[PDB]
Structures are given as C-alpha cells and as structure tokens.
Design a protein around this nucleic acid. Sequence first.
RNA 1: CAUGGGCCC
RNA 2: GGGCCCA
Length: 476
Amino acid sequence: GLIVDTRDVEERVHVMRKTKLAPTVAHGVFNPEFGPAALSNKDPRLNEGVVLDEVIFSKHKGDTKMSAEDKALFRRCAADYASRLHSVLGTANAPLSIYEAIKGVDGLDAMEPDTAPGLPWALQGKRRGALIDFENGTVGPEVEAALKLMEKREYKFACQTFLKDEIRPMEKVRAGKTRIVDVLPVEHILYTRMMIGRFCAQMHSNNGPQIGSAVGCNPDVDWQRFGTHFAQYRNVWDVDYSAFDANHCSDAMNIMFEEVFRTEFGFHPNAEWILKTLVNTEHAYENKRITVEGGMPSGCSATSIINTILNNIYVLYALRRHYEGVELDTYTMISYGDDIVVASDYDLDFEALKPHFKSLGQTITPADKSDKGFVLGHSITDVTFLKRHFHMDYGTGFYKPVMASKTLEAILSFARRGTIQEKLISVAGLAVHSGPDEYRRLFEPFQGLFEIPSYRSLYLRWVNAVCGDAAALEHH
RNA sequence: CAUGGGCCC
RNA sequence: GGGCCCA
Ligand SMILES: O=c1ccn([C@@H]2O[C@H](COP(=O)(O)OP(=O)(O)OP(=O)(O)O)[C@@H](O)[C@H]2O)c(=O)[nH]1
Ligand SMILES: [Mg+2]
Ligand SMILES: [Mg+2]
C-alpha cells in the first residue's frame, strides 16, 4: 500500500486494549516461543527503541505501478481465469435481496450480529444491535440510506484500524510486529454481499484445484481430496508472500475486478464499483487519519475470495511473463488468501519468477528457507497449507491435517478468561492427527482439571467424516 | 478484536 | 446466542 497524506484530527479511537489472552496451565510446561503481540505503544516486552505506531504501518512500501505492457498481460490472465472460473460456477451471479445478503444463502454463512459496527457507527456508540435486524432480514434507517447511496455510486467511507490480539512468535511480538485489522462500515459489507454474494456462495461449494480456490473447505475431510490431487505431479511448490494482502498494486486490483466481475457474467453493474472502493482506503487510527492507495482492507467482506482470485491471477501472469504458451492447465494450484500451493509436471523455475511478481508488488519466497532457493522434486507430503501438513494416515490410509507440535503447544498455552474448556475441546480435533502419543502429551497439562475427549472418540468421528462408508464398512 | 471458511455448542 | 483454528 502507498500512503499519501497522513494527518491528525480530534476524536481518538482507542484500540490498544490490554491483551485478553492469559497463560494456561500448559504454558509453563511447554514454554512456547510465542506470546500476545504487544498492543500498547509502551509495552515492557518491546525492544528499547522500537515503536508501535511505527512498525504497524510499516507494511505499506508503496503502490507498485504497472506498464501498458504488463497491464495488458494481467488483464488477459485475469480474463482467462475469469473464463475458466465462471465456466464452472456458472453465470448465475445475480444480486441478492437485502434479505439474502443478511440471513445468507446456501453456501454463505449469515453476517455477524455482534461485531465491530464500523464507522461512524463506532463513534456514535451504536452497534449492529441498533442498525440492522439479522433475524427478519432487513436494515434500519442509517443503513438503507447508504444502500440508496451505494446504488448510485456516491457512498464515501473510512476504515477503522484495530490491533489484533493474537498469539504470535516472540521474535515478531518483540519487534512489534502486531497485525492490524481494517474494519469497514457494516452497510458496505451488506451491499458487497448483495453485489457478489451469489458468487462467493458458489465459490465456496466448489472449492478445489479446478477453480484453484480452497475457500469453504474442511481439512478434516478435504485433505484426502487435495492430497491425492497434488500427489500426482512431478513438482510441488510451497510459495510464500510478504504482506500479500497489503501489496496488491492499484493496477492489478482494478484490472482484476474489471475482468472478473463483469456484468457480462451476470453480475450487477455496481459490482465492479463496490469492489474498487477498496483501493484507496481511508484508515483511521485513534486521532490519525492515514490515507492509503493500494492493497486490500484487513476486514472487507469476501476478503479471502479476492486474495484467492488475485493469487490465482498472479501465478498465471508470472509464468506467462517468463515462458510463452502458458495455459491455466499448464499447472495446478489452490489457495486460501495468500497461502498457496502450486504444482506441475514441467520443471517450472519459480526462482526466475521472483522478479515477475515484483512487477505486481509481491515478493515470493520458499517456505523451506533451509534451501534459500526454490528447488524441485518436492511432493505434496513436503509442503504446508493452512498451518497443516500432508501425512498418510496409517489407519484408514487417508490424508490427514497434521499441525506442528510446537504450533499446537503455543495454542494450548494461551486462552481467553473462562474459555479454556471450550478451546481444549476444539483444539482436540486438531491434535488427533498428531497420533495417540502426541495427543496425550499435548493435553497432559490439563488432565484432572478439564474434560479431555478420548483420542479414539475423536478419531472415529473423523473417519466417519472423511468417508461415512469408510467407518461403516469397517465392520464388514 | 474485523472478513471468510470450517469446527466446537 | 458463545468459544476455537486457519486465512
Ligand atoms: O488481523 C489480521 C489477520 C489476518 N490478516 C491477513 O491474513 C493473511 C495471513 O498472513 P500472514 O500475515 O500469514 O504473513 P506475515 O505477515 O506473517 O509475513 P512475513 O512476516 O513472514 O513476511 C495476511 O496476508 C494478512 O493480510 C490481516 O491483515 N490482519
Ligand atoms: Mg506469509
Ligand atoms: Mg505455505
């Protein structure tokens, strides 16, 4: 992203709330190199010299500009994908009624009833509870006012910045690498779902290598479907982006919308518009009013869908900018936002692709830094998608999401107040794939003070998930 | 603590 | 109507 006119005003929205993640009985047992990212400008852990209001906005290195040469290529790559995509999802992308946009549709969860209302909804001390009724499916006064405004391309707004209170690595938390969230007005999210909600709903229920999207999947069951796929390709790459969602160049974003959400595909005219209102965003941090021209807001509806689409276009635009005669079937991939997994028989050289992604403002890097460079010969059982690996379950011979033990430990070391028991159960369905032994150790610190489900009770549950008949015919 | 999926209720 | 994980 690129800043242009940083300034100050009056109102000072505070979000540096004291961390709400308290150590658990397991913490002192695992001593994870992780901890809640410093949310205060003057946090003890912070290094003597590093600033908060500084590092946080140090993700905007500018907005890479493109040439008429590159633009044309990206647009074509975005057109080819758009064609390939809609040739599956169909052309049924008509707008959704104010009702549908709320209560959601088949393949699209409803809107959050108790979340950040946005702005000025925040300064007016009024939350969604005093703006829209998520039960009958209708908006209130303030909201509808915007609808008639957004339906006329005259809706201005500002994004509210938040300091995500999460568990990050000490090295990152120490350097003050606290991730920030960009909250947009609730009406903006409501209209977005109206313009391209039918799309996302179809995008979700069709996740896979084909449309190259993993949005709307469940690792516990789809890992078997994804595994087999990338299991039959000469090479597999575990690419890594640096501030992916914050480096999308204005050119790429616009051209992407102009080619993917065309009315030609059954989309409502105001589909392209409502999406572009994300390029030049006006973030608001306390008394500051930073203006950015580029990147994607860390809180806009269908944020993952956009990233996934772009991520899909970049891989094409990249490979095509190096070779000639590259097609969407020249390689296979899938992604959920920035995290991506590519594969192909051709010994593609991603190393020589780095410069090409740079034209778009992205910086690709291998997830296996141990090699310091993109090498070949790697299979799917070597990469990691969504903090999950791809291991062959000795039991049912299926593929199962296996998170790193160190990652799980850090997860079982922190939690909100009076939410332990809950997390313990949720996370339990994640460690089951770490084998019986690990599942026991990981939950050892909570034995005698909480209810820990048996490794088997969760295992069977999983089997009946990956394949209901797998556990059924297991009796015959 | 937003966006979205998924899971746990 | 909560919580959790990934993004
Ligand atoms: O609060 C949040 C949570 C998630 N996200 C978004 O979700 C995605 C998850 O991505 P990452 O945030 O995982 O990569 P990183 O910055 O840790 O990169 P390096 O330090 O290693 O270079 C990012 O690409 C980010 O845009 C936010 O912007 N804010
Ligand atoms: Mg990354
Ligand atoms: Mg990865």
